[PDB]
Each structure stands twice: as C-alpha cells, then as structure tokens.
Amino acid sequence: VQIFGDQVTEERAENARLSAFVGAIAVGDLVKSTLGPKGMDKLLQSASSNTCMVTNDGATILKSIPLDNPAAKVLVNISKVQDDEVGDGTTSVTVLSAELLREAEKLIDQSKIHPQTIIEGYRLASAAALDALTKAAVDNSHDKTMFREDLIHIAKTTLSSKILSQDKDHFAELATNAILRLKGSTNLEHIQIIKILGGKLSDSFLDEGFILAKKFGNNQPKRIENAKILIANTTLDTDKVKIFGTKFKVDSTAKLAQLEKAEREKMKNKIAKISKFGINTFINRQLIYDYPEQLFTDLGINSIEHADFEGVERLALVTGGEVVSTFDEPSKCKLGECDVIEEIMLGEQPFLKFSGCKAGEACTIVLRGATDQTLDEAERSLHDALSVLSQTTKETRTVLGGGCAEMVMSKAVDTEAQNIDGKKSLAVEAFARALRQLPTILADNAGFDSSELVSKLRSSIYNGISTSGLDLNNGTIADMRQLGIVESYKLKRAVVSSASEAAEVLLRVDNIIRARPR
C-alpha cells in the first residue's frame, strides 16, 4: 500500500545511511585541497550570465554550488554559521565533520556500534576536548606589546591560507593597525575596502583617514587646509514638507512668483544658518541639487553629494564630530576637525584624501591587484583576517596551532577513554582518530608523508613537550613559539563545537523523505 503520492523518493534501509554518508564524503573530499597554506584555489562557473567567482573559503563555495542531498545542506548550513560567527575555519568544520561521519561509518558497518553509543562517546570526548583548551590557553592581556605581537602571528596564520602568503609580512602590520585603530569595536562594517585593479599586489596601504568614492560637484577646490566638517542627514534640497496634503490656492501667477521665491528664501535662510557655524566643508547624504550648491560658493564652503548611509557612520567616526540637523542651535551641536583635505587619483576614478584627523575610530583599506578576481580574493582574505583579530580583542585567550591544537585534544581524549571501559571506548577513540586527520590533510596538500610525519608528532607530545608541531616549508617538527603562529580561543572552541554538533545531526538519521519539487 503506497501511502505516498506520485514521485516520492523514500529510503528506509541501509542505502539511506549510505546516501547520507556518501554525500558528506563528497562534500568533505571537495574541500580537502583548500585546507592549509599549500592548498589550491578553486574555480566556480556560474549558470547565469557567466559570472565567474574565484574563492578559497568553503562557505562561499558550498553556498554557490547546487546540491540536492539533505546531508549536503547540513554541511552548507554549518559552514554558513561559521562564516557569519567567526569568519574563519569553515573548511576545517566541513572536513572534520565529514571525517567524523567517515570514521563513524566503519563503526556502523564493521564493528556494528549503535548510533546512540557513537554520539554518547562524542559527548564525553568533546567535553574532554574543550577542557584541554581550558588549560592549554594563555592570556596575554597584562601587556599590550605582547598582545600587539599576538595580532601579528594571528594575521600570519590566517593570511597564509589565501593567495597573500608572500605579502602577509606587509599586510600583518596593516591588519593589526586597523584593529588598534578601532580600539575594540568589533563591527566589520566600519572598514571600507576600496577595490582597484592594476599595479603590484604589494602596493596596498592604510591612510590615516577616510577615502571617499566620489568627488566635488562643480567648482569647489581640491586642496584646502583647516576644514571644519559638518554632516547632515535631512533633505536640505527642495524641501517637501512633512504633510503632502499641502497646496497653494493661487489667484494670480504674480503671487505664485512670490511663493517660489519664498521657497528660495527659506532655503537661502537655511544655508544662512549653516554659515553661522563658520565651516569650510559640508557633507550631506542626499544628492544636492543646483540651487543650494550655488550658495556655498560665496560662503567659501565645500560640498559633497550622494554619500551612502553606511558611509556616514564611517565618516562621522573618522572625523570625530557629530551628524547635525535642525541648525537653529549651534551651541549644543558638535562638529569635527581635520588638518588637510586633498583630491587624489588612483587609476581612473578620483578620490578625496583625508589626513590628520583627531579621532581615529575607523579606517579605509585600498587594495591593489591585477584581476578583479584577485582583488576579490583579497577582499575575502582581509575580511576573514580582520574578523578573527576583531574577536581576539574581546576574547584575549589564544591557542597554538600547527597540529598542536588537534593533538593536545587527542592526548586528553585518549586518556579519558580508559576510565569508560565497555563499548563506548571505541567511539571515543574514533573521535580521537578523527582529530589526527586534520594534520594529515595539511601534510598531504604540501606533498609530504601522511604516516611517518604524523607519527613523529605523536611521539613528541607524549614525551612532555606541548609546543611541538608541523612545519611545512621544510617538512619537519619545529617549535611553534619561534615560528610565531597562533589562533584565538573562540576559533578553536567554535570549530570543535561546530564539527562535533554537526556529527550529531547525520548520525541520528535513518529515513530520508523526499516530497515533490515545486
């Protein structure tokens, strides 16, 4: 008795677990090459308008590619949450969560372990895993110079995976200065990344100011000094009063000539109130029409038009002033200050350069590359780098990487497996052996041995040296403190918790129900 309708695919047998497990293996193997510093970039061919996209992050790749498997959606969704939460470590969650299901496959088939036992071991194994990071962390909050050095090494670790592995020595100073500029503001929207194609990749810079994408309107000068900035959000152009039911009962056109004159008088009166501040620059988000633009010329005030609302927030914080409207009361209102303003040209589009501002609560980064795809990859590199360093301020604790983070978890996880005697020990050992594969694929991408190199890292830590790790440029074990690579505590806490809970999803599934497409 077929209770379901026509064209209803249902799998209530071993093929359901096989179809769900092979889907994660396909998603897992897709991202094995993108992990590590020697990883290869991937290429995406869009189906609409031939809009290509080059990206190394697994979140952008898996969201762009179509996948009809329900298991693929979990790997897509866990990567989307990791991309939005931290902004780094998405491929580690995808490859680790798939390897946990890969390691759990042989327990179901060969050893015939219950699914409730595998997850029960992962609960106790994940608990001991996070406890290892509790003692393995180090707080560098007592000294700012050491914390300044920590942001360097975290930038060295995050930027090495992308195409900027050579130029990370220069952008590490650029990345950490933007974080010390923001002085704790973890909002990534306060950094404008201006995209410019052409020039050498190392020609990027970080000017102490805010760079506009637009220019002056008609005749206002390029070079000035000692300018007072005033920002406004209201219309300031052909003021349509708040009630639209207004009308003019005109008995003669001569009186209507006075009414349009009265609209110019109040606008002339409004600009007269702007001059009471004694300013030299005025900025408004709405596009400025011709009539109020002309009155700024006689007053000696500059005018900038059509600024975006997200840029007004960046513009207010770099200038250090305040957005002013309802200009009758100039006493309570506040305005910013700047030393020099000058219009520059980087390529074809001109830009406005600000330098010497008082407040430095925000900045703008100007990137240079060759192809828009390289430029774009650069945009997705500093965003992932600055996202990790931004959360490092609120979460000062850090963890050493390079295979040492995954192994010190396995050292504590393997110790706890003996005190839980029974059939659960195989599940906890499967969680341990899943963690050994992260330094394995990191060695496979560089073209080194998978067994002997991991075996040397195994013996080095149990001897009583909790600072050993993999070094990929030479292919041998080296000290992590001397090389200077380290990750944040929130990152390693996130990928272990995300990959652990991701394994809990597709292990509690036995039946797959597919309704009709719409």
């Binding site: 005749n219 008995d251 003669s252 056109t253 209507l256 009414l259 609209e263 011709d290 002309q294």
Partner: protein, 192 residues
C-alpha cells in the same frame, strides 16, 4: 526658464472672468522681467542644461530671447557643466538673485558654421583667472566605427604622455629590453 510651477503641490483657481487676462499678462511678464534683467548684465549667450519635469526654455520665452539677439542652447549633459565652468571660467547661475556680471565668462567669437550637414559651435579665445585650462579636439571620418577607433587610438597616445609626466624617464622599445632582460637573467640563472 518656464512658467511658475514649484515642486510642492499646487493648484491655480480662477474665480472671476477678468482674472484670465491678468494671469496671461503676468505669465509673459514673469518671462519678460527675467529676460529684462539679462539685458542689465549684457549677457549675450546662454547655455541651459537638461531640464527634468518640464521644458527647459518655453517657446514664449524664445521670442524675447531671439529678438534681443541671444543665442539659446539647451539639452546639455549634467556632467559637462563642470567642464564648461572650468574652461570658460564662468560660474554657474542657479537663481537670478545671484545673477551678476562678475560670475560670467568672456569670448571673442561664438560662430556656428554650416558644413557637411553637421553643426559645430566653437568658442574662439579664452581669458580668465584660471590655473586649470581646458582643451577640445573634434574627430572627423567616414563612419562611426572609425570615429570610435580614432578616439581610442588617441587615448593610447595621451596615456603615453600621461605616463612620462607621471613617472620620469623612458626606454628604447622595438624588442630591446626583452632581449636585454632575457640576457641579464640568463647570465644570473646559471649562478643560482
């Protein structure tokens, strides 16, 4: 330059029959007195931009401007207003209250010749207090496809002059530095 119609909503009401003669007199007078004040500043040529929501210059206004010997040109692009003010040194005029003699430019001859069925309006001679003069070069040819390539061929020519004034110095082309750099790196390649 048009009859009065503000951006704010309005509605003209006629209560008495004799008011129709009055408003018709005041409409042309609103165009006449504004054109009368143009004669006070003795401005001889006017350039209007592209007008939105209404006609730029009313046909009734052209009779006042044509009898007083004033050239009228409309439908100019908005981005070119910066070009004309920078070249001619004439500040724009957005209101008659700010319309004065000091803001206007100067020119010796504004001639519109008839040649090959294509009109050209060219200004001869510029003199002003301006440290950023302008330049204009027309293109002629057989068809538009050659006009487009003659423009882009000049862009590649000006970009060479832009590069020399940007970065000082130059090198001799014709395949010279490719063989020279290949010889130089080939000398050092055997040492490394």
């Amino acid at each position: 330059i048009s009859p009065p119609k503000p951006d704010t909503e309005n509605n003209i009401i006629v209560n008495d029959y004799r008011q129709m003669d009055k408003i018709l007199k005041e409409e042309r007078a609103y165009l006449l007195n504004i054109c009368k004040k143009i004669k006070k500043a003795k401005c001889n040529v006017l350039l209007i931009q592209k007008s939105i929501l209404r006609d730029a210059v009313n046909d009734l206004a052209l009779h006042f401007l044509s009898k007083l010997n004033i050239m009228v040109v409309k439908d100019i692009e908005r981005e070119e207003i910066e070009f004309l003010s920078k070249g001619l040194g004439c500040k724009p005029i957005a209101d008659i209250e700010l319309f004065t003699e000091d803001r206007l430019g100067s020119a010796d001859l504004v001639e519109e010749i008839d040649s090959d069925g294509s009109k050209i309006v060219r200004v001869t001679g510029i003199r002003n207090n301006n440290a950023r003069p302008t330049v204009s070069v027309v293109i002629r040819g057989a068809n538009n496809m050659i006009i487009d390539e003659t423009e882009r061929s000049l862009h590649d020519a000006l970009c060479v002059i832009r590069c020399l004034v940007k970065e000082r110095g130059l090198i001799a082309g014709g395949g010279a530095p490719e063989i020279e750099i290949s010889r130089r790196l080939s000398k050092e390649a055997r040492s490394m």
